[PDB]
Design an enzyme around this catalytic site. Sequence first.
Site, mmCIF file in Angstrom:
data_model
loop_
_atom_site.group_PDB
_atom_site.id
_atom_site.type_symbol
_atom_site.label_atom_id
_atom_site.label_comp_id
_atom_site.label_asym_id
_atom_site.label_seq_id
_atom_site.Cartn_x
_atom_site.Cartn_y
_atom_site.Cartn_z
ATOM 1 C CB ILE A 278 -0.994 0.053 1.180
ATOM 2 C CG1 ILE A 278 -1.992 -1.108 1.093
ATOM 3 C CG2 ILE A 278 -1.742 1.395 1.187
ATOM 4 C CD1 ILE A 278 -2.577 -1.528 2.419
ATOM 5 C CE1 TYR A 280 7.997 1.698 -5.212
ATOM 6 C CE2 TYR A 280 6.226 1.133 -6.734
ATOM 7 C CZ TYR A 280 7.509 1.601 -6.502
ATOM 8 O OH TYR A 280 8.335 1.958 -7.535
ATOM 9 C CD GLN A 281 -1.061 2.153 -6.556
ATOM 10 O OE1 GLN A 281 -0.390 1.319 -7.159
ATOM 11 N NE2 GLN A 281 -1.655 3.164 -7.166
ATOM 12 C CD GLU A 282 -2.497 5.658 -1.326
ATOM 13 O OE1 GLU A 282 -2.287 6.682 -2.009
ATOM 14 O OE2 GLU A 282 -3.652 5.256 -1.104
ATOM 15 C CB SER A 283 4.144 7.736 -0.779
ATOM 16 O OG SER A 283 4.608 6.660 0.014
#
Length: 424
Positions: A278, A280-283
């Site tokens: 999560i 990685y996907q977010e920031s």
Amino acid sequence: PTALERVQKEGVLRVITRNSPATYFQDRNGETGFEYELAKRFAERLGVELKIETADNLDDLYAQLSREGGPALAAAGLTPGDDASVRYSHTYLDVTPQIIYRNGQQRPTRPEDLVGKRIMVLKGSSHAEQLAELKKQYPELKYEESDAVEVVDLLRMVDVGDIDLTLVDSNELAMNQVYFPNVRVAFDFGEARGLAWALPGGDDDSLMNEVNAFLDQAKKEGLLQRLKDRYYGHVDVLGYVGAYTFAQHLQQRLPRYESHFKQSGKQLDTDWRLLAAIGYQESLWQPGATSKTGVRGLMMLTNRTAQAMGVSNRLDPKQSIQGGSKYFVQIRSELPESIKEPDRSWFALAAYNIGGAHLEDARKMAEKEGLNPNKWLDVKKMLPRLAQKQWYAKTRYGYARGGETVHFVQNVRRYYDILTWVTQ
Ligand SMILES: CC[C@H](C)[C@H](N)C(=O)O
């Protein structure tokens, strides 16, 4: 008793494979692998249990197969070998051997260029045999065969400059690209060929016929393609730049925040790799990351969620990881009792991105369509529709970017898979 009758009689199908995330991988969360999932499907087709063996290396893999009382078949990304001590099924995946080099070195463009390099391949591989062929033409070509490493190791060596080149199949390069930021395809060495399962030599074709019927059923229903996307799709789905950039971020960024993810994961009975995915996907694992949409930090929190969670600083990595982690668990806990794991987590991922109100609408919509609102694959067909008027005008909550929410959940699940398959 036939090969096929014996398998039924024993209620077990013995399969031998390579110690490899591409073929068979053991994790606390269960067993994965392109070959594992494909063989498990085969066993269940036959109404028997799957029993997996891993070889030490490729020579020992073929030696076990011809061994009396050994495995029924080898499922191991094998390229067809006249050695009637071993036979091969119909092929089930089109791959290309590719010469692999390190970015920022002279790219060899043709076989001539393979001369005078440090080259390593697996002892007993079709890749080794390709190089023996080329050597016949170019007598001063040098390379080494190794029985003490696997494909992941060959790529590491090119990655860090331990060797110059290796030779691997294009499926497994794609799979490994997300670990090795410097590794690149120099060129395709030899033409596209199908992978096949191998069986002991001989004339008993009872099991072979079933393998072929099964693999041909698999191509009918898109199973092989689905398995390809999961294990081998990384570069195709995330794009080339996304692939090698992740490898870089895994190397450079994650070790700063790995311990926070683990600590959040332990205290919440939640797999830390799912939490890291999560982040990685977010920031892209960047604590300072801010959007201009009201979300900020490693887990990308709103001010509101930050305060509810006891976060006094969203750009503090530890605090962002803790709050986003507690928040995910909260969301997942609030989902209706009717949603079972593993779907429950994939629903929670969608709610993390789109919120429970719009997600309810997608659930209500699936239900209206005779689908199952507690099954992720069903609701996932409904989410993109939230962005279409013929659909959203009929919803309580209206327009939402549900196609993006689908993208979100796929990517996280892929980053999750990737983090799971890391070896050391
Ligand atoms: C690592 C080499 C792999 C397994 C190759 N496709 C072979 O059959 O030899």
